[PDB]
């Protein structure tokens, strides 16, 4: 079997290929979003990473 | 030669089974009495309200009650007598040999 570095390289070439053509799958790898149809309104933390909290919308008084 | 009965009411189903059992009982020979087969129950569970009120429901069930009877010895006395008998609308009839 092909292993370690060589396998990693071959995995890398595959992702690289998707980006360069570049299919929707390739676009997702560009922005580091999920690739397999998961929702992104919530969760997706594994791909997106730690929460970058942001101000919300204020309420009236 | 056996007769199997089905219907949605147990009172009418049993009455007709009880009658058929009687019909052969007069005109010999032998009957294996009406046995109560297990009831198949179809349930429907529904949200009571028309809109959005999920946590309250109403349970509805539909019961197809079941009876089986055995006519041991045919004897065209009874084998005729049944074709000339009145059993209500609620019930359906299966006749085998």
């Amino acid at each position: 079997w092909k292993l370690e570095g060589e396998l990693r390289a071959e995995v890398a070439a595959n992702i690289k290929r998707l980006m360069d053509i570049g299919c929707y799958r390739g676009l997702r790898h560009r922005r580091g979003l999920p690739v397999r149809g998961q929702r992104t309104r919530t969760n997706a933390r594994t791909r997106k990473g730690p929460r970058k909290t942001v101000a919300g919308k204020k309420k009236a008084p | 030669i056996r007769i199997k009965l089905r219907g949605f009411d147990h009172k009418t189903l049993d009455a007709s089974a009880q009658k058929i059992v009687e019909a052969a009982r007069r005109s010999g020979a032998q009957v294996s009495g009406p046995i109560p087969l297990p009831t198949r129950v179809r349930r429907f569970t529904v949200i009571r309200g028309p809109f959005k009120h999920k946590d309250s429901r109403e349970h509805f069930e539909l019961r197809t009650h079941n009876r089986l009877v055995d006519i041991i010895n045919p004897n065209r006395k009874t084998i005729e007598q049944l074709m000339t008998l009145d059993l209500p609308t609620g019930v359906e009839i299966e006749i085998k040999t």
Binding site: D20, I21, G22, C23, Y24, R25, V54 | -
Partner: protein, 83 residues
């Protein structure tokens, strides 16, 4: 993916447009609503206008992208980001 017991899928109404082109000497811009079609070796060198739901997106096709659907190269949503 689509079971290979079945055939590789194209709409045929798009394939015939391509094949008629191959004869007479290509090319021509091809307007299609078949995102669902597979890209096929006879399509290389062409440019096929996939409709994303709003516009026909011109797509040039090469060998490196043969196994994919046409819709894969015409993204349906526009994002840019937030804030």
């Amino acid at each position: 993916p689509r079971s290979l017991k079945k055939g590789v899928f194209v709409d045929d109404h798009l394939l015939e447009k391509v094949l008629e082109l191959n004869a007479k000497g290509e090319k021509r811009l091809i307007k299609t609503w078949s995102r669902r079609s597979t890209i096929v070796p006879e399509m290389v060198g062409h440019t096929i206008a996939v409709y994303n739901g709003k516009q026909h997106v011109p797509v040039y096709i090469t060998e490196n992208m043969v196994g994919h659907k046409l819709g894969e190269f015409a993204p349906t949503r526009t994002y840019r980001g937030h804030g």
